[PDB]
Write a new protein. Sequence first.
Lengths: 307, 299, 49, 49, 49, 35, 279
Amino acid sequence: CFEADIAIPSGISRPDAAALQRCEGRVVFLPTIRRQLALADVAHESFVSGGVSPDTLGLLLAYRRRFPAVITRVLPTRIVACPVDLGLTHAGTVNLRNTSPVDLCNGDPVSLVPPVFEGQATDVRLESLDLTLRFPVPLPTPLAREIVARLVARGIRDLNPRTPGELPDLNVLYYNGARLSLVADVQQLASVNTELRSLVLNMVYSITEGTTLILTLIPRLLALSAQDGYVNALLQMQSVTREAAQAPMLMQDGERRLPLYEALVAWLAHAGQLGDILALAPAVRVCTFDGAAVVQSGDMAPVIRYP
Amino acid sequence: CFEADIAIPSGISRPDAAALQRCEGRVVFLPTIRRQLALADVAHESFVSGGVSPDTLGLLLAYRRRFPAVITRVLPTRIVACPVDLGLTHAGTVNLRNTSPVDLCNGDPVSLVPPVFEGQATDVRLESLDLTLRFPVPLPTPLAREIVARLVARGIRDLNPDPDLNVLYYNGARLSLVADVQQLASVNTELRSLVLNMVYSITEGTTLILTLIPRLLALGYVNALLQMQSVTREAAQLIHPEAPMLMRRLPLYEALVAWLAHAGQLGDILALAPAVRVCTFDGAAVVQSGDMAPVIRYP
Amino acid sequence: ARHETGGGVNFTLTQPRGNVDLGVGYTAVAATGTVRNPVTDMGNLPQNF
Amino acid sequence: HQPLIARDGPHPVEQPVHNYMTKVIDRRALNAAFSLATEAIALLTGEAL
Amino acid sequence: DVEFDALLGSYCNTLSLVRFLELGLSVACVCTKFPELAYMNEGRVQFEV
Amino acid sequence: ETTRVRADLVAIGDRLVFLEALEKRIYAATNVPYP
Amino acid sequence: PRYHLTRQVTLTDLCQPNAERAGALLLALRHPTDLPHLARHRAPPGRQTERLAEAWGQLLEASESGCARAGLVSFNFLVAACAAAYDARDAAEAVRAHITTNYAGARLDRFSECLRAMVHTHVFPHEVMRFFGGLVSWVTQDELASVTAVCSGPQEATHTGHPVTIPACAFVDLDAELCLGGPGAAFLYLVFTYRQCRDQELCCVYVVKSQLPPRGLEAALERLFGRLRITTCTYAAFAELGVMPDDSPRCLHRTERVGVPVVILEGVVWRPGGWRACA
């Protein structure tokens, strides 16, 4: 585990000692690797920057440059945390707590998302030690990648107004059913802006010279549309692909460079990496020993290493 | 280690028993990690996902989903495999069977699809109980990321026709990718759905960005720094592509999530992450096809 | 069968065994007569292709 | 303390459990009352004799 | 002032160790000891009629 | 801090069976579906 | 299992670990007889791909492969060969006075040409010469080699930490990043910083010093650089050299084996990591 401890610094509200008991299996973001550390850098008051608190995109950027840690065992003197970034060498598969409305799967990669849900705030309050605690919500990673694209684009609509007030909310989610509504309260600009620029600048490099030949086959896409099932379902209705349909540009130097093969490389370099440069890295994977295929809300799932 | 047992089912023949003797040291995928398992969780018939046989996409969804296991010792009535994904890093040395490239002293080999090589090679079938064990191919990380982007590039020239992409030298050897006589006609129909995925994620985004960035910067730190590192690159791509192609905000930003949702799918689909490492001891550092290799647990 | 994980050691125990029919003719029939309840509510759902 | 039954194969292996719950006294207090009229006390005291 | 918070109760249940040669379904089976059944690929039974 | 065992033996026709029910004894509380 | 051994048999045409120290940060030479082919491929055609066909061919002139393949590249062999390249001269060049007096610049001069030729046709020296380890034993013969130099996690610097103490081999190397100092553990990485057609295909080898995650390292790879002035692209690759789980045991010395500045680093979790090169 390469054991790391966090002590109980000063006093105890006597029911709130039991509040630390039911947080077993949650995640602490501690911005270090320590053998002992105070509880002051733990809470959300440390997540608050100079003067201002981060938004749910800034908390992504706040959870960027800190280190997650697993609650292992809860003492009245200390709390032993295992440093996820290094000390994931656990054949004992140190256990986590699922605090999420989604019943997951077996075999999901699990990445951490700030509490942004309408009813799972994960707000526990300490008044003897005046601190506020937001636990991250562990979620499956495609469902995690369906969230971060919404919240930045919702903040993309925070730059430009123009349109009438009835906008698509980006606030109805879909997992097999299960209509989810999240919170849209505040959108800090710099958390939107720096997230928007890497969405711009990576999509710059992901276009290359041999990429341009693919753009010719855009009318070839709709030729498969009215003659099969798979393509017509692949072609989205709310897509620009159905909108843009309504050429080599020769410039041929040398022609032994494999121009089409080189196109799919650098496109995958930056447009292939769009979930992980915006959000947190997944290192938690669902692995139950008993053959249980799903893990209930509130359960203690065994946790294995990087996916 | 934590060795897991896969149960041999009822009456098999001696060539079905000898088929179990030609697989000592292969790679096996399994859904759950129960200490006793059956052969019904193993076979290629256990890969059905929509009522039909899976493609190389439908395998690589599961090949990134379920769990690798490597058979150390074969048995009657059992299959002993010390699985890779359990255990601490760089412990529990295991042994693999090479396929035609080298697998050098390092390389961190990756499990991937059979039909990128000979399709009815390593599709070993049990004759009695009539099931099929299509073992994945352990390729090292540079060449595994190389060949995956070539056939889908070859699928483009096979899509809508009018150099030859298939030579692809290794460090010493000349690797014949083309197994012509019956495979390549089955190649472009078994990577059939997959080529559409590499295309549609390109046609959507590029035709989205050329109506995103002109709709941006005037709707300012990201504004001037948009083409700062993209001077004569993005504006030149705005000069080249927007001229020889065609040219709405509320469906646009609705399409913004949907493409990037498909993008986060493909990164989990593609790029073939390393799972196990070759870093042996007292070997000749160079493995040949059909020979064992000491293989250690974590990248 | 031992396996050391996080926390402490974890002993697993299994006993291998088998069976046989050992009857040349039929043995052990099983009738089915009482119902608790239907599992489904018997219908009215479209199929979506 | 609960027992268990060792299954096999695809169903996961089990391990014994323990419970250890704790319960709390609640305190009721029930009441009776009665009266003595004013004429009776000095009679019981020995005053009005 | 005199105060005490007292402890009043602790109870354990019996864990019933029930042998297999007790119940009525011991009749249909003739269990017998054979080690090393893991070593066979066949020890299987052949019978006349 | 070779013996007698109780069971229930109904005789029907000219036969005899150990009519005995489980799950009140040896399946209860173990989270096992009664087969 | 927190102790491992690895072995590769090569020549002493490369590193000559008898001329090295007990602690050296060895590279392999994976794909050693490679790169006539990838000289031709992966590059735009304005690079004149007939350069690396001769360039590595002059390297093994200084060094027929036989049955002992060319490998086990030293840590010294890149620092001094790039000493004339990157922004340190007469101090990085003291590594050349370390090599040519103990190892040979004949093999450097062919390879410093490769360091202008590999980076020329976009054949970048990351993902070639992959990490091998810290030179545990040197059971080599006279002109041949047999080295055990274990990979495989923290055990290289425990089984040379319960006893080589991991030099940095140049005080210019071990880049003192995070002068914003605090307590914790050190996270070591191997970055090749480039300059493409500005300094005519620059080569650089140095180790960073950070208590930073891989997600807090890429923006740390965009900041602190002055070699952005390029446009081709895909500069500044990096992999994990692993964790030094102590910032207290770093040192400052100039004594080795020619007085070469050197940094003692005791106790290292050698997480082997993975490379990344896109921008």
